[PDB]
Amino acid sequence: DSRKTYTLTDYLKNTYRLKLYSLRWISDHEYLYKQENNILVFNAEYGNSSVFLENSTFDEFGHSINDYSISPDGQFILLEYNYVKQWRHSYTASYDIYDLNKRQLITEERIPNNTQWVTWSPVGHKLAYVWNNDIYVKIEPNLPSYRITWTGKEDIIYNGITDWVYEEEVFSAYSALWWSPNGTFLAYAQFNDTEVPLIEYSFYSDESLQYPKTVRVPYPKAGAVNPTVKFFVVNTDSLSSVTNATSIQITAPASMLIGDHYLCDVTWATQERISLQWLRRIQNYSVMDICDYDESSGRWNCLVARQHIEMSTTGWVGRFRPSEPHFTLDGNSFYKIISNEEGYRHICYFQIDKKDCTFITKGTWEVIGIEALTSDYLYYISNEYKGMPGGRNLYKIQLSDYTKVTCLSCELNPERCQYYSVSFSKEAKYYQLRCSGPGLPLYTLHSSVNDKGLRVLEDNSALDKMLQNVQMPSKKLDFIILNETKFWYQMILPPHFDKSKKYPLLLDVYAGPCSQKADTVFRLNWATYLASTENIIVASFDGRGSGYQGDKIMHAINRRLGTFEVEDQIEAARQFSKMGFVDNKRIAIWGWSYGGYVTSMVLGSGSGVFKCGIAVAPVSRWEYYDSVYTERYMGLPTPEDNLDHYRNSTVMSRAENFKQVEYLLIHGTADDNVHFQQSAQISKALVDVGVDFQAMWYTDEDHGIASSTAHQHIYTHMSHFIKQCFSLP
Amino acid sequence: DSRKTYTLTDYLKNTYRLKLYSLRWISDHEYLYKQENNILVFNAEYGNSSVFLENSTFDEFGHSINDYSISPDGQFILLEYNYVKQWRHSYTASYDIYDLNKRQLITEERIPNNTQWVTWSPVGHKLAYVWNNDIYVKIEPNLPSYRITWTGKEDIIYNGITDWVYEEEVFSAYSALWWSPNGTFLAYAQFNDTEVPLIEYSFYSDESLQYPKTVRVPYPKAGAVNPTVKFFVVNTDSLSSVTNATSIQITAPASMLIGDHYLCDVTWATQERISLQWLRRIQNYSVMDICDYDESSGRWNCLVARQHIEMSTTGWVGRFRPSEPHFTLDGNSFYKIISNEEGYRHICYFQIDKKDCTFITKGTWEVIGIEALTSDYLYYISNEYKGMPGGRNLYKIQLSDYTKVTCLSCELNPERCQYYSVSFSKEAKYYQLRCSGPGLPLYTLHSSVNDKGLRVLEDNSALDKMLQNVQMPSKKLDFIILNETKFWYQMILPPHFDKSKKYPLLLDVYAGPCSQKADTVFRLNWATYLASTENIIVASFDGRGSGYQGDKIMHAINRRLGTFEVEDQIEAARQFSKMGFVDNKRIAIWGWSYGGYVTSMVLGSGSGVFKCGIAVAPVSRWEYYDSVYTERYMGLPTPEDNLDHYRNSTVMSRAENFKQVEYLLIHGTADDNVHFQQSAQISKALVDVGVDFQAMWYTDEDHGIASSTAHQHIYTHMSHFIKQCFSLP
Ligand SMILES: *[C@@H]1O[C@H](CO)[C@@H](O[C@@H]2O[C@H](CO)[C@@H](O[C@@H]3O[C@H](CO)[C@@H](O)[C@H](O)[C@@H]3O)[C@H](O)[C@H]2NC(C)=O)[C@H](O)[C@H]1NC(C)=O
Ligand SMILES: *[C@@H]1O[C@H](CO)[C@@H](O[C@@H]2O[C@H](CO)[C@@H](O[C@@H]3O[C@H](CO)[C@@H](O)[C@H](O)[C@@H]3O)[C@H](O)[C@H]2NC(C)=O)[C@H](O)[C@H]1NC(C)=O
Ligand SMILES: *[C@@H]1O[C@H](CO[C@H]2O[C@@H](C)[C@@H](O)[C@@H](O)[C@@H]2O)[C@@H](O[C@@H]2O[C@H](CO)[C@@H](O)[C@H](O)[C@H]2NC(C)=O)[C@H](O)[C@H]1NC(C)=O
Ligand SMILES: *[C@@H]1O[C@H](CO)[C@@H](O[C@@H]2O[C@H](CO)[C@@H](O)[C@H](O)[C@H]2NC(C)=O)[C@H](O)[C@H]1NC(C)=O
Ligand SMILES: *[C@@H]1O[C@H](CO)[C@@H](O[C@@H]2O[C@H](CO)[C@@H](O)[C@H](O)[C@H]2NC(C)=O)[C@H](O)[C@H]1NC(C)=O
Ligand SMILES: *[C@@H]1O[C@H](CO)[C@@H](O[C@@H]2O[C@H](CO)[C@@H](O)[C@H](O)[C@H]2NC(C)=O)[C@H](O)[C@H]1NC(C)=O
Ligand SMILES: *[C@@H]1O[C@H](CO)[C@@H](O[C@@H]2O[C@H](CO)[C@@H](O)[C@H](O)[C@H]2NC(C)=O)[C@H](O)[C@H]1NC(C)=O
Ligand SMILES: *[C@@H]1O[C@H](CO)[C@@H](O[C@@H]2O[C@H](CO)[C@@H](O)[C@H](O)[C@H]2NC(C)=O)[C@H](O)[C@H]1NC(C)=O
Ligand SMILES: *[C@@H]1O[C@H](CO)[C@@H](O[C@@H]2O[C@H](CO)[C@@H](O)[C@H](O)[C@H]2NC(C)=O)[C@H](O)[C@H]1NC(C)=O
Ligand SMILES: *[C@@H]1O[C@H](CO[C@H]2O[C@@H](C)[C@@H](O)[C@@H](O)[C@@H]2O)[C@@H](O)[C@H](O)[C@H]1NC(C)=O
Ligand SMILES: *[C@@H]1O[C@H](CO)[C@@H](O)[C@H](O)[C@H]1NC(C)=O
Ligand SMILES: *[C@@H]1O[C@H](CO)[C@@H](O)[C@H](O)[C@H]1NC(C)=O
Ligand SMILES: *[C@@H]1O[C@H](CO)[C@@H](O)[C@H](O)[C@H]1NC(C)=O
Ligand SMILES: *[C@@H]1O[C@H](CO)[C@@H](O)[C@H](O)[C@H]1NC(C)=O
């Protein structure tokens, strides 16, 4: 075989590039798609298109446009520019609105620079935005804004946007604004961080900055004072009739008000009914209130007969938070993913004023998400097919007959396609299927009326042809049985893999709660190079604490992070050794974030199994990580609750055992998420017991170490380290 | 040779210890000396002693005593405890006073906790102390304090103590208090840092600390707003319990008041006469005022006829600051080191009211310091002997006939002893000589009247016996000639050095202005180990910019840091690499502080001479370092002054040239001096150009990286790096 291999430069320079097909539904039968910087509009039924916005239109706009957003009535387009990233989801930007009918930029009453969030109403062309921590509404794009809040205050009061911890750990979004279905009402949350402590770190900036800047962020570490939250609804239709429209507060239930709590979900049911879910700071008790607008009082009332409790005796509520409800059109019932009596997550059907629900799916597999609901069908993704917890398919269940469940994707291309996601048009008339592996991604379009495939949108035939000239690695997905339970693993195997040889092995770890590192997804990544060019097996194992296999497995680490999930990676490496194609003297481990924590715990365990390892941006002590994530699994770090385990589960306490291994510790100095502090404390502990190790800081990089140069630098540095460890030239 | 070598553990565990003999003169004929934690008093003439304080005296004291200070009259001892270090010289502590006559600890009116500086008067037993940035005076140890100042304010107003930059770069001390010779008057400086910007950096502390602390220090970087200064004198004999004390201000001369300036020296001449030197912010102009008490007005007057101006056309004034004057007994004349008309620093004799001084020494060598003055002789250290700028000897010059100069140390033991310092008794009746090399240190006592050698105090004979058992390296000191000028170097050569073999070579560099790395001092350090155990030659070179050889050499880098001193280290290595016994494939370079900057500039030069190097806490860009040191050499970073060269002399601009060398970059995170920022910007520049390198941070370590565990860890890490570079096992 004289074909080239997949090299590090190939990875770092994106030589072999996956094509996507990212579309945006603007209706029940049209979508937008960018082609040669032109935005085209496509007809789903026939596949013909036209130019929606010529790629030259904003030549002489004077700025580079980052993104765009069409009003639901298609009368306007919002153009985003001057984009400046903040955390994982947050950023600020400038906005212009372009009038499509008269084909002209609107120059009057512009959205201000440094706007934090903007969203159209779901119907028409109203806008809500947040600027300097207060909410503003525009009824018409060219006309003046109406201010909604006056309490906004940098780092203290957040209206309509989340603070750091709610952005990262509860909403996975910066926005905390929710328009009603037809745009009459605007709901929002207000966060108060007044007594929340600040994480402080230096940012060095360009070489020209003489004094470093101190970045200061309200961030509650485990056990600290959390932000408090209030919820409001305003009637935007009243805005042009009164000077100052009233924001009506909906208070949390008494069972939440007795102590610390969170708002964790907001979902509109009808034009005059909203559901809110609340969670206790001890995250095993959740309450949903269903609240109706009282026209005679202008108030929002939440009948106790409509309140729904969710709790767990074995762990926390939800995979990472309570699931979202999907209401029927009349808003009198809803479907929601709930853990059943056997501990498997399945779809339950609720009437709003009845406490007991009815499970409509069951079995020893789980529903991943509900994707669409019509009058006749519910569409969901699950890992049922072939009992592979790491596969994903789309299913359809008849609402009048639950025995009628159809798999829409399972058999389309079963060899190539075992991991799907879906994108439905506005009334679920069409759907795009996206297949992520195990073969090359395939994107296809389907009609819901007959479930027939309309056409292939992207098939990655260009890449298929390129990769034919490369010695690519293969991937095995399989399981081992421990204590009568199947635990799944994957291996990236070198080309021409030969079972009678002994290969070096790298264990690639994450292993946080509900994680999944063994799956059917196709990836071109660092492991690809390591296997293809360096003949290293790269393996991953999903042990106790891992997700999508029921609560018996997921809740095994409840109140006990740093125990079974760590031990199970060690045992996985033992089991791989027993398979006979692994060089016992050359087994390494690596991970990022939680995977950095686990790597570090494994390297400090004294097991003798691992020669070396690499931790990137590790957690080292749970008291240094945020409250919402940490306490979900660990409870509170007090003598009365779980302080003893918090104190027993640190990396630093294992420092002496690092004498036995080669370690490389890496961290970005501007990491707002897992603070540089965490690695600073690992290194001090290692120095204090006289252990030699290797280190690398990345100036001004955050948790993703994702700038183009730093990305290339880190993988280059790590490659040298691994190769040296394994005596590879 | 079956003998052991000098190993890394020997260096780190201090297995081979130099003995010292630290005495404190308390009169013209007695000194104090600590023996077995007893404090003994010695008669200089006969060498008999008595116990002054038993080591058992404070057995039940209840705190460990950090240090002590006996009052000049022997009646009290000040006991220092609860020591907490601040910067290079600053610290706070608690103090108790023990009355030696009544053998009792004083319990009334005690010195407060967290005291910043304490000092006895020079005669008797008055005390002055600074607490909460204000000055207090006690006339008797058991009596209440008189508060002298009321303006003290943390980080803003400093009375009687220095701020960060005056401590490090001006006074080399935290105290800004100066008692008059008999204690009548107490002079002091006040610093005002109102508009000085703060450097901010994180401090992580013990693992128990949930949130990192931000340390904030008023520190003026090059070109930034500097502290301002005022000077005052108070009469301690006329203090009142009923009224606040009156401090008299002495203002700076008008030629200083015109712009930014510094107070740089304070020296009392008589009981009623004080000298002050001031320095312009452009540090090539200095003025001395001589001020006399006026008993009828109670004020201090400085006659313009007694003003003495000092300026430099080629550089800055003084080696690092204007030199201190040495007044005669009547205070009508003084001696001071000044650069002569050929640029060599020699002793000049001034009359207080005459502009012209008379040089009393001359030659192509320099006076290092003035050590004592009597009516007949002035005693000084110089590098005259054998024309060796890296040796030091004690001389006396007859004040009535300047042709009569006598070397007092040169011939005592010329083979062992070529580097001396001295400590004279109160009226120069006796002196202690301290020989530091090139043989083992030797401490001897002498009488001035006929320069008799009275006795050997400590000869290090025990260490000599031990060292005969180990294969110690040798040291060569010699010179190369670069266009017509001798430049000196030293090499630490392996045991059994064979000039027909080719050894690897490490260049140990500092090379700051007025530095000297080639000398006759005996050292037991990391180089000792590298030569003795690893057979590496460790060389050092003093090129342009170096000290003690005249201003033509020292001022060669005026306004041009990072040019000639860098070029000259490359040239030295180029020359060493041709000498016959050097392996030109294995030459390395390392340095700390200024030496880290030079190392980094050398590695970024593109010379091709060096395989690898190590930079510890380097300067990387002059705009990041403090105003007083930086501007002394570089002027101000403005377009009108020297900005272009500030911008041309960074490490970051040379990043691309690091592609052909191996570099290790090390910095402590709590470096208040050369901020971690400076290395953070180097790393980012190398990442940006795609250059791989090695790094190590030291959490919570400062510029010295001097904690016991961090010290051992750094030298261990550097040793592994150099051995790898040189292919040494
Ligand atoms: C965000 O939450 C903070 C509390 O964490 C609220 O701050 C508190 O506001 C109350 C009422 O305005 C303050 O009480 C007042 O104190 C003053 C004395 O200074 C007294 O004159 C008043 O009669 C009353 O007692 C309280 O000082 C303040 N507490 C803190 C810790 O700042 C704040 O109002 C919340 N903001 C919003 C928009 O919800
Ligand atoms: C330490 O130095 C600071 C900085 O120069 C001194 O503060 C300054 O003090 C003067 C005199 O009080 C202030 O002058 C005032 O100016 C304002 C204009 O803002 C004017 O309204 C008044 O007529 C007055 O003249 C000046 O503002 C002030 N600057 C500051 C604090 O930023 C301070 O007095 C010095 N402290 C000591 C103890 O020497
Ligand atoms: C050191 O000893 C001196 C006396 O020592 C005598 O020892 C002889 C061997 C010889 O060298 C002789 O010349 C020398 O004098 C102590 O001196 C004494 O000091 C006290 C003062 O408190 C007086 O009472 C004595 O008169 C005086 N003797 C003389 C004439 O000097 C001295 O105190 C002692 N010093 C120490 C620190 O122990
Ligand atoms: C709109 O109404 C709100 C709520 O009443 C007003 O905000 C209050 O303003 C007063 C006076 O400044 C404060 O004391 C209250 O604390 C405010 N409450 C809130 C909820 O912010 C707001 O000022 C009104 N704006 C206008 C234009 O009248
Ligand atoms: C969007 O829904 C809202 C709420 O139901 C509608 O506003 C109500 O309209 C009804 C008329 O059927 C009236 O009884 C009320 O006066 C309105 N109530 C409120 C809360 O304002 C609104 O008209 C709907 N919009 C559209 C376009 O149908
Ligand atoms: C939510 O979790 C907490 C913490 O585990 C539970 O509180 C425990 O309650 C048990 C039984 O009532 C007590 O014996 C313990 O003292 C509590 N745990 C500790 C050690 O803090 C609570 O019961 C859980 N709630 C649900 C719904 O199961
Ligand atoms: C000694 O001088 C200080 C001058 O400040 C006096 O102390 C202050 O008096 C002022 C009144 O002008 C108060 O506002 C302060 O609180 C006082 N002290 C401090 C801590 O600043 C003091 O009274 C003077 N004593 C005499 C005898 O004159
Ligand atoms: C310390 O020196 C001071 C200053 O010369 C002496 O104080 C003077 O002494 C005479 C007494 O003979 C008085 O007439 C003067 O008024 C004093 N001057 C001042 C400024 O007070 C003093 O004698 C010396 N003190 C000691 C300890 O000897
Ligand atoms: C102190 O140094 C400054 C800076 O080098 C000197 O100022 C320069 O002097 C020359 C000659 O007059 C001028 O041509 C330059 O333009 C001056 N300014 C600068 C910023 O370079 C000053 O002359 C020096 N003083 C002494 C005593 O020599
Ligand atoms: C897409 O084309 C539509 C034209 O309708 C006919 O197209 C023929 C090719 C055939 O498939 C017939 O069945 C169709 O009736 C037109 O109406 C749409 O406006 C076009 N859409 C876009 C976005 O270009
Ligand atoms: C602009 O659009 C046209 C589509 O016909 C295409 O030829 C051209 O390459 C596009 N340019 C950009 C900016 O990609
Ligand atoms: C946004 O900032 C730009 C650049 O300074 C300015 O010209 C423009 O007027 C600003 N836009 C708004 C809405 O204020
Ligand atoms: C204390 O002092 C005695 C007196 O000579 C000395 O010999 C002894 O060894 C010392 N030991 C201590 C307590 O340091
Ligand atoms: C110093 O602090 C200790 C402990 O609080 C206290 O007992 C002592 O009195 C303090 N000393 C003085 C002189 O203030």
Question: Where residue A362 sits, what CATH number does that domain have?
Answer: 2.140.10.30
Contact A443, A432 (CB under 8 A): yes
Contact A261, A280 (CB under 8 A): yes
Tell which residue, B628, B623, B677, B671, has the closest CA to residue B191.
B628
d(CA B91, CA A34) in angstroms, rounded, equals: 66
- For residue B687, what are its two tokens? 């990442």
B685 close to A (CB below 8 A): yes
Tell me whether residue A257 is exposed, middle or buried, using C-beta atoms within 10 angstroms of its C-beta: 0 to 12, 13 to 18, 19 or more.
Answer: exposed
Domain endpoint, select from B471, B491, B517: B471
B680 close to A (CB below 8 A): yes
- For chain A, after which residues does the C atom lie more than 2.5 Å from the next written residue's N, i.e. where is it broken? none
End-to-end CA distance of chain A: 20
Give the residue from B225, B687, B700, B709 with the most A CB atoms within 10 Å of its CB, the best one to mutate: B687
Shared domain for B358 and B463, answered yes or no, is: yes
Pairing of strands B91-99, B104-105: antiparallel
- Resolution reading in Å: 2.0
Could you tell me where the beta strands, DSSP code E, fall in A425-473? 430-435, 442-447, 452-458, 470-471
B717 three-state secondary structure: helix
Cα angle, residue B140 at apex, residues B136 and B144 outer, rounded to 5° = 50
Number of domains in chain B: 2
Shared domain for B460 and B477, answered yes or no, is: no
DSSP code at position A384: -
Chain A residue with minimal CA distance to B677? A204
- For residue B305, what are its two tokens? 């006829």
All residues of chain B having their beta carbon less than 8 Å from the beta carbon of residue A204 are 677, 680-681, 684
Per-residue HEC secondary structure of B302-358 comes to: ECHHHCEEEECCCCCCCCCCCCCCEECCCCCEEEEEEECCCCCEEEEEEECCCCCCE
d(CA B53, CA A270) in angstroms, rounded, equals: 91
Judged by CB atoms closer than 8 Å, whether chains meet at B214 and A204 is answered as: no
Shared domain for A208 and A99, answered yes or no, is: yes
- For residue B470, what are its two tokens? 């180990």
User: How many other C-beta atoms can be found within 10 angstroms of the C-beta atom of residue B479?
Assistant: 15
What is the count of residue pairs from A and B with beta carbons less than 8 Å apart?
Answer: 117
Residues in chain A: 729
Which residues touch A230 (CB under 8 Å, ≥6 apart)? A189, A190, A192, A249
B125 is catalytic: no
Contact A567, A602 (CB under 8 A): no
d(CA A423, CA A439) in angstroms, rounded, equals: 20
Domain endpoint, select from B423, B438, B471: B471
A429 close to B (CB below 8 A): no
B161 three-state secondary structure: strand
A369 three-state secondary structure: strand
Contact A300, A292 (CB under 8 A): yes
d(CA A670, CA A92) in angstroms, rounded, equals: 19
Tell me whether residue B274 is exposed, middle or buried, using C-beta atoms within 10 angstroms of its C-beta: 0 to 12, 13 to 18, 19 or more.
Answer: buried
Residue with CA at minimum distance from ligand 11 atom 10: A36
Method used to obtain the model: X-ray
Shared domain for B294 and B424, answered yes or no, is: yes
- For residue A575, what are its two tokens? 């089991």
Q: Return the residue matching tokens 């002495």.
A: B250
User: Facing residues of A373 across strands?
Assistant: A378
C-alpha distances in angstroms, A669 versus A365, A600, A696, B681?
A: 41, 19, 10, 12
Hey, CA dihedral for B435, B441, B443, B444, is it positive or negative?
negative
Shared domain for A592 and A613, answered yes or no, is: yes
d(CA B90, CA B162) in angstroms, rounded, equals: 9
d(CA A50, CA A61) in angstroms, rounded, equals: 23
Residue B113 CA, ligand 14 centroid: distance in Å: 6
Tell which residue, A232, A231, A124, has the closest CA to residue A183.
A124
- For residue A246, what are its two tokens? 């009233």
Residues in chain B: 729
DSSP code at position B669: T
User: How many other C-beta atoms can be found within 10 angstroms of the C-beta atom of residue A241?
Assistant: 8
Contact B557, B549 (CB under 8 A): no
B174 three-state secondary structure: coil
How many helical (H) and strand (E) elements, i.e. helices and strands, does chain A have? 12, 46
- For residue B710, what are its two tokens? 């961090």
Which residues touch A299 (CB under 8 Å, ≥6 apart)? A248, A293
Tell which residue, A576, A563, A516, has the closest CA to residue A542.
A516
Contact A645, A560 (CB under 8 A): yes
Shared domain for A505 and A411, answered yes or no, is: no
Element (H, E) at A488: strand A485-493
A420 three-state secondary structure: strand
d(CA A549, CA A556) in angstroms, rounded, equals: 12
Instruction: Please report the DSSP string for B632-644 in residue order.
Output: HHH---STTTTHH
Comparing CB atoms, the residue among A198, A210, A696 nearest residue B623 is A210
Distance (Å) from the C-alpha of residue A217 to the closest C-alpha of chain B?
A: 12
All residues of chain B having their beta carbon less than 8 Å from the beta carbon of residue A712 are 690
Torsion angles phi and psi, residue B338, rounded to 5: -135, 145
DSSP code at position B718: H
Torsion angles phi and psi, residue A40, rounded to 5: -100, 150
DSSP code at position B675: -
Q: Residues of A568-587 as b/e, b for ≥16 C-beta within 10 angstroms?
A: bbbbbbebbbeeebbeeebb
Shared domain for A544 and A399, answered yes or no, is: no
Shared domain for B534 and B637, answered yes or no, is: yes
Hey, CA dihedral for A722, A724, A726, A728, is it positive or negative?
positive
Q: Return the residue matching tokens 């030696």.
A: B100
Shared domain for A278 and A334, answered yes or no, is: yes
Cα angle, residue A139 at apex, residues A137 and A144 outer, rounded to 5° = 70
Contact A189, A250 (CB under 8 A): no
Tell which residue, B139, B144, B145, B135, has the closest CA to residue B120.
B139
Shared domain for A559 and A623, answered yes or no, is: yes
d(CA B592, CA B597) in angstroms, rounded, equals: 8
Q: Residues of B711-723 as b/e, b for ≥16 C-beta within 10 angstroms?
A: bbbbbbbbbebbe
Shared domain for A98 and A54, answered yes or no, is: yes
Shared domain for B135 and B173, answered yes or no, is: yes
C-alpha distances in angstroms, B640 versus A516, B631, B644?
A: 62, 14, 10
Angle between helices B594-603 and B564-576 (to 10 degrees): 70
A105 close to B (CB below 8 A): no
User: How many other C-beta atoms can be found within 10 angstroms of the C-beta atom of residue A84?
Assistant: 11
Hey, CA dihedral for B6, B8, B11, B13, is it positive or negative?
negative
Tell which residue, B66, B129, B142, has the closest CA to residue B101.
B142
d(CA A446, CA B621) in angstroms, rounded, equals: 61
Judged by CB atoms closer than 8 Å, whether chains meet at A675 and B212 is answered as: yes
d(CA B402, CA A148) in angstroms, rounded, equals: 90
Judged by CB atoms closer than 8 Å, whether chains meet at A211 and B201 is answered as: no
Which residues touch B176 (CB under 8 Å, ≥6 apart)? B158, B160, B161, B162, B166, B188, B189, B190, B191
Domain endpoint, select from A455, A471, A487: A471
d(CA A122, CA A180) in angstroms, rounded, equals: 8
d(CA B383, CA B393) in angstroms, rounded, equals: 7
Instruction: For residue B144, say if its preceding peptide bond is cis, omega within 30 degrees of 0.
Output: no
User: How many other C-beta atoms can be found within 10 angstroms of the C-beta atom of residue B729?
Assistant: 5
d(CA B426, CA A458) in angstroms, rounded, equals: 95
Structural domain boundaries enclosing B205:
1-471
List the CATH number of the domain containing B586.
3.40.50.1820
